[PDB]
Amino acid sequence: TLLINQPQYAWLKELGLREENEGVYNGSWGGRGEVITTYCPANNEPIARVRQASVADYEETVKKAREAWKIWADIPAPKRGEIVRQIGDALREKIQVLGSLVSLEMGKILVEGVGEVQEYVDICDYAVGLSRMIGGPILPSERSGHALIEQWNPVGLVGIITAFNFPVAVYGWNNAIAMICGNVCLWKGAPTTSLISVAVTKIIAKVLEDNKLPGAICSLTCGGADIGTAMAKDERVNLLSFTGSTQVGKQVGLMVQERFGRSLLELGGNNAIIAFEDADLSLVVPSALFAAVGTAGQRCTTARRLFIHESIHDEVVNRLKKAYAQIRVGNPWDPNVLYGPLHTKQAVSMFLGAVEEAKKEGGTVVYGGKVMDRPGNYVEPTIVTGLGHDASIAHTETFAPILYVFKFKNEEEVFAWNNEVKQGLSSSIFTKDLGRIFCWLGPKGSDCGIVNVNIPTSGAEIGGAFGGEKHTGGGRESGSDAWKQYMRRSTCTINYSKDLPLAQGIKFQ
Amino acid sequence: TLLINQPQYAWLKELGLREENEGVYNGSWGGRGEVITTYCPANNEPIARVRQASVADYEETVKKAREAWKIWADIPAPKRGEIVRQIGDALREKIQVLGSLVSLEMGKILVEGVGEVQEYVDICDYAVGLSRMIGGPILPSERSGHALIEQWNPVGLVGIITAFNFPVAVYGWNNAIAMICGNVCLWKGAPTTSLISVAVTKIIAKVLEDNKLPGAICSLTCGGADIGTAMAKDERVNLLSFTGSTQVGKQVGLMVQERFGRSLLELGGNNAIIAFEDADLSLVVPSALFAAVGTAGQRCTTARRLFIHESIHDEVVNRLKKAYAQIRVGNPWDPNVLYGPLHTKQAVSMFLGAVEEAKKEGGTVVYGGKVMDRPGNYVEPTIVTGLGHDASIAHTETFAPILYVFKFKNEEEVFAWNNEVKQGLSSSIFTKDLGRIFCWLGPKGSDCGIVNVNIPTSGAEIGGAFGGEKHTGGGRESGSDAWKQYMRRSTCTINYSKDLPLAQGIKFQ
Amino acid sequence: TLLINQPQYAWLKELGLREENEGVYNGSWGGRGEVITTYCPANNEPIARVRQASVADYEETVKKAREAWKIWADIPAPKRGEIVRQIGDALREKIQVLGSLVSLEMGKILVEGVGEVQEYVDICDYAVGLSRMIGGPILPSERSGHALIEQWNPVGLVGIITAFNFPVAVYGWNNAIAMICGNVCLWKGAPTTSLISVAVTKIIAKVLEDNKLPGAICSLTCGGADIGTAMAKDERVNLLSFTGSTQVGKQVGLMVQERFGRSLLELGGNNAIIAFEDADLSLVVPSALFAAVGTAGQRCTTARRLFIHESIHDEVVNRLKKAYAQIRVGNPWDPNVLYGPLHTKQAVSMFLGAVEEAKKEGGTVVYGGKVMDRPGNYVEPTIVTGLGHDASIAHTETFAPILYVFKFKNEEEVFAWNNEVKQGLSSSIFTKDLGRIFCWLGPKGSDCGIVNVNIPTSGAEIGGAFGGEKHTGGGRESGSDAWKQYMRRSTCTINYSKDLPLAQGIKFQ
């Protein structure tokens, strides 16, 4: 029987969720595609069902979204910001129940589910101010009697494909920014977090309807690769923001490139922490532990490589092991719990595949490496030593809590090992050395999109642009001038003079 | 006999050119690939020869450039700016002969040959100032005792593939900007302007050598599709700036996307001028004439579609006819000449094919449409009326002076008509109406990268970013924050505090 | 008897006002100075009393504010934004009653009273986003091994002196921006809007105290010329933002300059509307009326000079007269009322003095010019023709609804007449001419801080910096980078290298 029909989970009804939910919204709710059941990874119990989008559902939604864009693009940006402010408020009112659904359906611990909604709330309030700021410079033209202005305008329909592991915030970052930039949005979330997508869409849809705006401004078409592939090939999707694996993201980038679309890619990570000999080990150990095992190691910014200077390597590994053993495991909604399950059974199989591969490639499991004998998709957070920094399994992103630990001696080689992988998302050094810090930040430092000092690989806030380089895709979200990806630039020269161009010897009238 | 061996053209030697020239420069000059002879399009006479790059040359040059980047990225940006200033001055010293070579080898008139070099001089001087400005904001972190900074660092090796029609300036825009941004450059020019590429490279090579810097910072590998494709597939080329046809540019963009490189695409145009009923006809006629037939219609920003309100359509056509007849044809280096030959004979075949196609699709040739009976690749500048705006040949970019004239009645439909094509480079309206002007600049206006008012489609200066949308590729060059395409952004969080992370109940030491 | 003691006005109690109110807040409420009773200008009845600050109150408050700054400056800018966001919400909950108090005590109509509070709400929401954005660039140092960063830090204590006519918004702009910029504030409002200052401070005080923050971050010392002068002479007031008359503002500016403090001066206006022969008269006539008679002509941005091209002068005046006769007068809190009373009985006398002066200088009163025979400080909105543009009374700011009308012929002279006065606040032309518009916006155009086109002199929103030039004082508030006046810039060079400076022949160790 479904969890939503059990009294313990009656709070789901506060999100407007029922036994079977419509997975398409374009101003009206529907869903004529395949019905999907999503499961709680903490006990493998079914929660509720979502009717996904058919092709006809998708077609109607895209058409309705583009119609609504005619209205929405004419609303002054500060007024679009007001809507996004109200979206932030509607999220605040539901932050507890929504964060509980993230914990239930995705499986991260409750504070992180609530934290994910706080991120959406925060980006909305940031985007309110940005909505009075976006634009380009008025530049001095070299031409007398001419103006030169750089204009920014919405691209139109922004498709937003998101991953299971941040089922609210990632969409939130794209939605708040794309909306103030005058775009309509079409959301296709990960199938295994369909309820989260539906619940978020209901909160947003109420704000739009209360403001007598066409609901298709924030359209939703739940679906899998079928719908995702349509969006990547669809010329009507002016910007396709894809957050997901590098493997899938590469094909989406090619499909969008084929049709001269815009893509914003947020792909895989293989993030390293480097602890130098002068590092505060009382900061290194907890920073590494929490960055490696947080979210059961299923963050794009999870620390998956730990380089320790040889002088302190054994002590850090030993202190890390003694700390890992104190990780409190339980239901991700239960208090004091720090560690929940992997998102799917398949991830557990991939976890076990990686551990064996690390063993064959010469690595030693000094902690973990096994499934936990309990309901749900629980695996032990795992520490592997002795692999070469160039081991193939170390260069792969295994979206599971496995930390590969390496020795190093000198600064130049270990920056190179950080940069040698194909991923380019997050990175961190722990050190007190002022010259080393700025070398790390400089042209011979880390090649990642996020380059941190004395804070782990998940250190990131709304203020800055978030994203990676190389196989991480190159897109940026949230802060700085990331909004420019959601708009088109035009360089506009206006002749307001009476001057006529030189006749150049031709006799005009 | 080669033009370089005739006393009449001995000025070529002031650029360091000889009978047979090395087309590979990486600090040394060489070239083991095919020897190409380029011809003067004004008389189809051979000028001189250039030995192109073989694969071994390309491999050697990329290795040397990437080594030199280690040196060049360590040079403080303002000092790189000093280098670019010296390059600008070196171009000043050769501006006359180099413009003559552009006129001789490419075929544009001398004033534009000189003007193209001046643009490079100008963009150098701009980059001198920019070299003290590039960077990102210090942002106020939400975390006490942390700094949040946005860093920009060079991408590394910037490959630069350029087209025949602006064989100095396009490279120049990419070189000056990529260089102050700390990148090394690898140039593959159009095969038919191989002498221009060698001449420019020699000018830069002396400046680098005088500053005791590795010449491979501005490397040259002359070649055709073979070398161009290698750059598009080469993981060592961090950014590939490609200027050329949409057809070729699309394949470059896919190859770069396939390997998760960066591309900067500057592809084709199909640029429209719209003359409204209130336009100043004394501005419309010369603006349209010079924009349509300039550079024999071989600018990416050439006016290829002219929309005129019905009330003034016949008068504007008649005045354009009276003006076209006065276009002075001759050798592009001859004094007072306004119109030279097409770049190749193949271009003439495309011209005649387009004219014949337009007549077959119902258009009327009211001026031109014929070859000129003289040496070189000379065709008559051509005006075509009576085609429907949706005619297939009107929607294709034929790189020749063919101006298709259409009637319109209303603002909305003609804005739709500007936007209905696949190209998205330049656009112009001519009008006095204030509200129309701002609609053109707004979200329901022109969808192009250059959006002009009372100035034709070639109105652009270095102060602003230059580039197009849709099938024009989305890249930007020169002004505004175009320099960011030449760098990688990192969002850097620095914990300078002694604060430790929350223990969350785990007992650390 | 006091209005607050009559049941008709018991809503005053919803703002926490009582018969006698404390006019000092520094974390504690007090007031040992003079007790002032403020009056409703619509009926000359007393409203309630306020105990103003003694010298000892001011001394104690400044000390408490600077101690509070030590805590407040340590709060990360985004979290200060969160406090400001909450101030915005608290103002929302009180917007109706607070605007009603503005109408009651100051005398502007209700929609402008609520609009003034909405302005404070809007700038707060803006300041939330800005709080993640304020800062400077990281610049590329010319020195190898050096970083060059521009830092921004709070100035410390921002004193805020405000005028009667915007008793909420002006303070709001300064408070929201100063607060996220890490400053503490000291407010001295106009004595005749003391209840408004008390009421606003109570709303702010609750948010600060609810967040366990020292109340002195938003300190209040109600008082007149005494307290303002002390603030202007007090070295502990790092920035004094003064809004008021040019006469007082000039003395405030000199006192602050004497002590090498910072001032932000928002002084008097003498704002002109220019209607050209091509202007849309159906837009001009209402624009002038609402800008001239709005707030009974007591906005700093009120239209006080109307230049009409001679061809349309008689018609525009005739149409204005026909419209003026329909202006509805009444209690400013009554919904049909468009026109309320002048702020004081003295202001009424000044109205009469100016009118008599206009007649003495040769002007003709073609509409209005008299007090209205009703209770309160009601005067007829007045139109004066025939004065020379250089007439002494026309160059004076009379804070009353008197519109001086002038003929003009040429564009250059009427721009000159816009600029010939000492005030430099706001300016408007109404025209369709593209060249004239950009000339107006250009260096030979309007010399004012607000330069409007086809919208009157009160056209302004928070997105932009608000303020004037010349005797208007030069300060700026609200939008763009106006925040920089509330912070101090430092240009910071960090040598992180191991490099030692040249010995220059000296033997070091």
Next chain:
Amino acid sequence: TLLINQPQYAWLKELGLREENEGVYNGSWGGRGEVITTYCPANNEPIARVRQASVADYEETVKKAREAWKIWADIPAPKRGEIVRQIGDALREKIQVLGSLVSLEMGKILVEGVGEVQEYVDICDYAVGLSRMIGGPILPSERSGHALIEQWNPVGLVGIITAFNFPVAVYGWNNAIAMICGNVCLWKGAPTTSLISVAVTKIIAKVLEDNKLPGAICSLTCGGADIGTAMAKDERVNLLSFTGSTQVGKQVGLMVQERFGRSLLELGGNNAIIAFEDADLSLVVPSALFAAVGTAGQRCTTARRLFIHESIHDEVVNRLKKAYAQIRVGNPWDPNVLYGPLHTKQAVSMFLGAVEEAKKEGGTVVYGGKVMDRPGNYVEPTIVTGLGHDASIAHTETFAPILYVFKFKNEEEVFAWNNEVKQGLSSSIFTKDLGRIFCWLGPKGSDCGIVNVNIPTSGAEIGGAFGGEKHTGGGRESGSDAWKQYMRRSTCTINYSKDLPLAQGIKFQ
């Protein structure tokens, strides 16, 4: 006999200098005021004469400058940059002889005179790029059918009063920036560097005349306090940039404030170097020596206070003593000299008063403190220990090479001691501590406009804005957005719509 009349000084003629030089330039050369003779401070020999400005000279020049502004304000900013580029080139051609004039007439060593001219050349090249960038944002209006633009226009006439100690660079910074910003300039240099002012003006005047531009764009009126005071009282001088003593600068600021002009104040410094126990002493000692005795201690950024941690105080003082003993004294034009004379005999007298006062206030002269018994104005570079950090003489700026040395123990008090003085120009700490460095850069760190780390107080480059806080005046020169002080901002709202304002119940026609 005049130095210029001796063959040994025939090089002065390369600057166009003669026996008696006209000290007024406004397109014509003149000078009816008093004839001043300037002397070489190394030997008190007269160099040549300058005819200073009478009042009538000044009056005619301001009028000619403002007339020239009408032409200059119409020239596109990029083209004004081209003028400044050419100024940069003309300075390049004369850098050696001009630098020799700086050493001869002002008295700093040859490398610094030449370096001073290089600084002017550099800011020109920078301003060339800036001239295509200056301007404001296009903002998203909250009003449908409205544009919101921030425009910047020249202020008009920029008066520039400069000090003796940087008689070329300071003017150059203001001139390069003021000119690209569309202002004309009126220069009054220090009387005792009049020949330098004329030599510079001659170089600029040639560039203007070769470009057929009115010479009054860069006017020169040589004179003393009288001409200086007239500029500060003159309503026609829209911005007065003043570089000089705090004493004089305070009166300049008050006079400018009195007439609601703009002032840009660059006043005195009392700059501290702080050495923490973890400092690289091999970096500290030379840094301290060169920053304290450079330019005979007559830089505004000269290190005048040295704070050393008690653990290392005696060692740093001893090592500094041993380094002072090796400072090479001689004629500033001798290439082996490091230390030349003070600028005037009065400076020597002030030096002696300071040394005596330091003794009277309890300090011990551990090195120097005496006049040198030799021709010219030579004093010994001086180190004073034992004074309390609050001794009055240490809080005074004595423009002489006197270094006051103090002990400190903790970080909080030494930051307070850096900040306790009235001056706020430059500041430096030497340390490796990451947290201490960012505290220094933060809100509880240095209160100065220049805040340096492991580089002395004279560390600044044109890329950043240069200037101080508190009694240093608050102005900024050169980099960042310093250009904005030379222009006026306008916030411009343009209604381009057909929309009419709500009638609010009035029946219009």
